[PDB]
Amino acid sequence: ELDLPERNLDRRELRDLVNELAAHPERWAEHVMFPEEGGRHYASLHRDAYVDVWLLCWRAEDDTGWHDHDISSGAVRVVAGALKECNPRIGGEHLETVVSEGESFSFGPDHIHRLTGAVHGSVSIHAYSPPLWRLGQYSIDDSGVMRRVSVSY
Amino acid sequence: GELDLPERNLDRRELRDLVNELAAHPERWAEHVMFPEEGGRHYASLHRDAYVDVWLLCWRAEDDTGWHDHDISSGAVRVVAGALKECNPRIGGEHLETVVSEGESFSFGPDHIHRLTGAVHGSVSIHAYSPPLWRLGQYSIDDSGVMRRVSVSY
Numbered sequence: 151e152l153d154l155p156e157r158n159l160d161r162r163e164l165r166d167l168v169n170e171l172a173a174h175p176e177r178w179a180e181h182v183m184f185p186e187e188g189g190r191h192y193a194s195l196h197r198d199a200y201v202d203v204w205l206l207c208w209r210a211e212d213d214t215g216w217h218d219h220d221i222s223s224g225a226v227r228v229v230a231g232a233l234k235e236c237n238p239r240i241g242g243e244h245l246e247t248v249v250s251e252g253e254s255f256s257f258g259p260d261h262i263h264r265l266t267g268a269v270h271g272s273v274s275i276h277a278y279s280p281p282l283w284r285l286g287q288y289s290i291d292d293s294g295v296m297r298r299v300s301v302s303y
Numbered sequence: 304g305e306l307d308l309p310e311r312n313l314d315r316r317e318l319r320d321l322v323n324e325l326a327a328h329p330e331r332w333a334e335h336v337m338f339p340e341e342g343g344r345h346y347a348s349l350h351r352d353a354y355v356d357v358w359l360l361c362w363r364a365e366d367d368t369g370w371h372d373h374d375i376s377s378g379a380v381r382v383v384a385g386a387l388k389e390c391n392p393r394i395g396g397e398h399l400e401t402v403v404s405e406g407e408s409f410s411f412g413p414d415h416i417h418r419l420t421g422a423v424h425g426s427v428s429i430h431a432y433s434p435p436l437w438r439l440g441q442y443s444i445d446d447s448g449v450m451r452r453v454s455v456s457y
């Protein structure tokens with residue numbers, strides 16, 4: 151568990167949190183894992199009524215798929231390696247940005263994105279407030295029509 | 304007024320049955336038909352409880368829902384009079400459009416993204432959602448073209 155405030159954090163406070171956590175490897179180093187399993191490894195660092203914090207360790211294959219975080223704001227800090235964040239554009243030519251170690255970003259509740267194209271062994275820290283208990287996963291039937299499946303987390 | 308329904312969330316076909324059952328019973332909704340004369344569509348709640356959410360809608364030719372989802376709510380719609388256009392979004396920008404005419408009904412599961420437009424002035428429709436429609440996602444686009452989803456509370 152982390153020792154965080156007993157309230158919701160806005161996106162700039164989430165960004166401060168993921169960046170200060172990056173500078174405190176004591177909070178997360180023991181949770182760094184890359185399975186011979188295949189499959190993306192998650193590690194929860196903190197979950198309470200206000201904030202969720204995760205440590206993600208990325209393989210080159212990992213893809214979040216398109217999704218929003220319902221009512222959760224969030225922030226991401228890349229600790230090692232690099233990620234690609236994709237934002238959806240009506241038309242099909244999505245904007246893609248590479249986020250490298252040391253760099254971070256934040257988003258509000260209306261955000262839709264996809265995190266993918268990771269360097270193998272990449273590590274990142276993700277923080278959400280309110281907690282990420284629901285997320286919407288966007289899919290496309292081969293008829294082209296998009297849907298949003300709201301999933302627990 | 305109370306509705307004799309299972310004490311649970313209803314699937315999309317049970318909602319469709321419900322809206323068609325209600326349509327065939329004018330005694331329950333004819334009272335509440337009223338067509339407004341500015342922007343705001345006129346909504347009339349026929350029944351809301353812990354499982355279901357039933358509305359009577361009266362459309363003007365302008366009325367547009369905008370692109371939106373219903374979060375985790377399944378839904379059904381029966382057009383009582385007039386006609387509605389149901390748009391479904393496609394990647395590529397060429398969205399699917401379907402005219403739903405008086406007497407016809409459709410239903411959808413909880414993953415549905417659509418847009419409803421009044422295709423004929425004076426139209427009347429009955430909508431049912433389950434679970435209740437407490438939050439809705441309304442999609443918008445920047446000039447940049449990037450899509451966002453604003454979770455609204457109705």
Ligand SMILES: [Cl-]
Pocket residue numbers: 224226276
């Ligand atoms: Cl994220």
Ligand SMILES: [Cl-]
Pocket residue numbers: 378380419430
């Ligand atoms: Cl609807």
Ligand SMILES: [Mg+2]
Pocket residue numbers: 305306350351352
């Ligand atoms: Mg009831």
Ligand SMILES: [Mn+2]
Pocket residue numbers: 214217218219263
């Ligand atoms: Mn995300």
Ligand SMILES: [Mn+2]
Pocket residue numbers: 368371372373417419
């Ligand atoms: Mn709708």
